Amino acid sequence: MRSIYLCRHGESELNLRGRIGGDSGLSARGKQYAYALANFIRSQGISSLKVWTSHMKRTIQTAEALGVPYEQWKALNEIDAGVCEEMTYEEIQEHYPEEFALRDQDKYRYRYPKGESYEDLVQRLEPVIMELERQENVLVICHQAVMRCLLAYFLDKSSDELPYLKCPLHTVLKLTPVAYGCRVESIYLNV
Amino acid sequence: MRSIYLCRHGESELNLRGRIGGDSGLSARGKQYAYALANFIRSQGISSLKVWTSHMKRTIQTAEALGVPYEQWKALNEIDAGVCEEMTYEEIQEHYPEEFALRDQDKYRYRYPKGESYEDLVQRLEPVIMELERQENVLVICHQAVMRCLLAYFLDKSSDELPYLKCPLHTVLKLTPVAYGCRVESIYLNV
Ligand SMILES: O=P(O)(O)OC[C@H]1O[C@](O)(CO)[C@@H](O)[C@@H]1O
Numbered sequence A, B: 001m002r003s004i005y006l007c008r009h010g011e012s013e014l015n016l017r018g019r020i021g022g023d024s025g026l027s028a029r030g031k032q033y034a035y036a037l038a039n040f041i042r043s044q045g046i047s048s049l050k051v052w053t054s055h056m057k058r059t060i061q062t063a064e065a066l067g068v069p070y071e072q073w074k075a076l077n078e079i080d081a082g083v084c085e086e087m088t089y090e091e092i093q094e095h096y097p098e099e100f101a102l103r104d105q106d107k108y109r110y111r112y113p114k115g116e117s118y119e120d121l122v123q124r125l126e127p128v129i130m131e132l133e134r135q136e137n138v139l140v141i142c143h144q145a146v147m148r149c150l151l152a153y154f155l156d157k158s159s160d161e162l163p164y165l166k167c168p169l170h171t172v173l174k175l176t177p178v179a180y181g182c183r184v185e186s187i188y189l190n191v
């Protein structure tokens, strides 16, 4: 049976600082996760695994530790926060108080100044989903907002639930599409 | 009429590092705010004023920039996050996934392991509001969660609105209580 493995890049430097977006590299234990992922994947004994990543350094660097070849997709790049790129939440509240308030109102269609909305994100992920459907075993190393969009599709979630789906770091979600829907398994790689 | 000025401690070290809770000191620009605050209060042309703070260093240090005495209330201490104290959101999502998700569904009543809920904070602040109601001009230098509870009372907000009320840093809220309701003026001190 085919299984789709979904996970995020290992812990980035900006993740450690509590800052959003950007294009930073993996931290120390972020790299230890890349190694732990390589171990888990091997132990899965998956037949002909296709591996996808984004153009962002953090995803690429995580895939490198696997040894096997992978492919890069621009459409898998993290959601653009626009002007709020690399800010902490406190900084967004202080410098864009009205914008921050509008988000909680409708997290699905809200756009930061010159940024993307979850709706924009779902649109550019359409082709990524179409390919995913016509594949067998695949591992997608992406980002939190991207993972939420892909996960919503497979676990059949609404536009309301989507922006709030649980997608923590160092955790792999093994989704097995079945006739009644989709089975899920969560594997936490403690590093 | 008299006015109640509500604001937070200047930007702290943990605020800058994207971490919550703790007992950290003011950052460089966090101190600039403490001085910019003194200048704002000065320009108000107030004859007598009571300044209250919590036991947290960040609030105390901010009061120190005024050059006037102040009273310290334990009741004005920021909400306790328990085991999640001094952690980032990503950190909390990873190591306490279930806990994190449960908070989102009921932000008002939820308590982190060994922590407080917004409901507890509201109860803890009862004697503070009572005094605030029987005083003249007062300046309360407190915290984000504490500030939201106080602001909710004066502006008549429901427990559903309370946890999401806007309370950014370096922003003074001048409240003027009247017959019914309360007047509000938002003053931002750019530093
Ligand atoms: O605010 P949330 O719920 O993290 O939504 C998506 C977010 O993903 C992030 O990568 C969070 O680290 C941000 O860049 C983006 O705003």
Ligand SMILES: O=P(O)(O)OC[C@H]1O[C@](O)(CO)[C@@H](O)[C@@H]1O
Residues within 6 Å of the ligand: B019, B020, B021, B078, B079, B081, B144, B145, B163
């Ligand atoms: O973080 P929230 O959910 O907006 O609530 C107020 C928060 O203020 C903090 O100081 C940091 O966000 C936390 O201690 C507290 O939970």
